[PDB]
């Protein structure tokens, strides 16, 4: 429970940093749709969760490098929050 | 087996709630395609499974917040049903 809350804080820091760095990298490329923070934060969630909606994605080199940072840090930190909430529900099954 | 069936019931409750809340949030946004329950239920499955077909997705703030609820609750509950059915097949291997 104490470690699960830490992984949540790590995930939020990746999302805010990944959203800010994506806008900073994509602005300047003709045709980039990842140019505002409110939806770049939504893109960082799509990346961390790998939900695959395919509506926003980076088109630049650094914007894709920022995505790789959000991929490695996001999928890992989200997998921890997923596994932590999975063990919590497992304990609720034995309690019944 | 008793806990696996509970995770299935939890997953179905997330899908129905996530489908109903998505339609309620997306209706009112010019251009929203997630406006009917039969396909919003199909969208909630795409979100919980992260299959990534990219044909339906929310465009509003709350509709994306509802998606985050479906992401956290769906991916976790679906990962339990996946791991449970994975251990069942593992037991069938030792039995041969």
């Amino acid at each position, epitope marked *: 429970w104490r470690c699960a809350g830490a992984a949540t804080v790590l995930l939020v820091i990746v999302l805010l940093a990944g959203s800010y760095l994506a806008v900073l990298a994509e*602005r300047g490329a003709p045709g980039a749709q990842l140019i505002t*923070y409110p939806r770049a934060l939504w893109w960082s969630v799509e990346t961390a969760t790998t939900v695959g909606y395919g509506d926003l994605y980076p088109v630049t080199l650094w914007g894709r490098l920022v995505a790789v940072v959000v991929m490695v840090a996001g999928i890992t930190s989200f997998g921890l929050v997923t596994a932590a909430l999975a063990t919590w529900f497992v304990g609720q099954c034995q309690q019944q | 087996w008793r806990c696996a069936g509970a995770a299935t019931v939890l997953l179905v409750i997330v899908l129905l709630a996530g489908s109903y809340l998505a339609v309620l949030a997306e209706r009112g946004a010019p251009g929203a395609q997630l406006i009917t329950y039969p396909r919003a239920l199909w969208w909630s499955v795409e979100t919980a499974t992260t299959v990534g077909y990219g044909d339906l997705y929310p*465009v509003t703030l709350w509709g994306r917040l509802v998606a985050v609820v479906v992401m956290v609750a769906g991916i976790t509950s679906f990962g339990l049903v996946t791991a449970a059915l994975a251990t069942w097949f593992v037991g069938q291997c030792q039995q041969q």
Partner: antibody
Amino acid sequence: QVQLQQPGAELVKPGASVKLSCKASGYTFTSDWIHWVKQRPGHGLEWIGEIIPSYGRANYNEKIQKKATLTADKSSSTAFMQLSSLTSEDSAVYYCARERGDGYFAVWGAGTTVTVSS
Amino acid sequence: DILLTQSPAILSVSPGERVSFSCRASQSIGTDIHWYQQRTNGSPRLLIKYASESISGIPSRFSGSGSGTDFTLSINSVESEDIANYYCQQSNRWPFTFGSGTKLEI
């Protein structure tokens, strides 16, 4: 109060340079971008470039002639634009606008009436 | 480069009736359009943000609509202080582009 302050006018000779200022005031965040819009007399608004002062990175209009240099100083909260090698085609009112990173230009300046003549 | 074509360029209106400013985009940009007002010897004033969301202080006579490629700024019952030039601007793709503008005649 006036959130974005700009000088009244700037007279320059054909072929010279000038540094337009845009003094800011009020709330300032790290997600704030400063833009610049050119409006020639009798014409519409024309985007010139954007800059985020908290980082120092600036982008410019690639479809027109790149005759500006966007800089920023975080201490005075004032953004600058270096219009160099100006001609008759550069006599316009240059507005600066603040963007909260969400896309729109919520607050504008007063515009600097730059005239290029001998 | 999004091409925001505003048509018509001059709108001749009778007082008290409803008017509509059209702003077509070169491609589908969702609802990432914004409306600005600039009067004579003035600065552009933001009217509508994100197609329909209103701005604090702007009179509610200004109403926005449209999604995809076609967008509409509507003034329910016009008045004298509305005589200005109106510009639409997109933020869906970089760079941000403006429209040709439309003048309001009464």
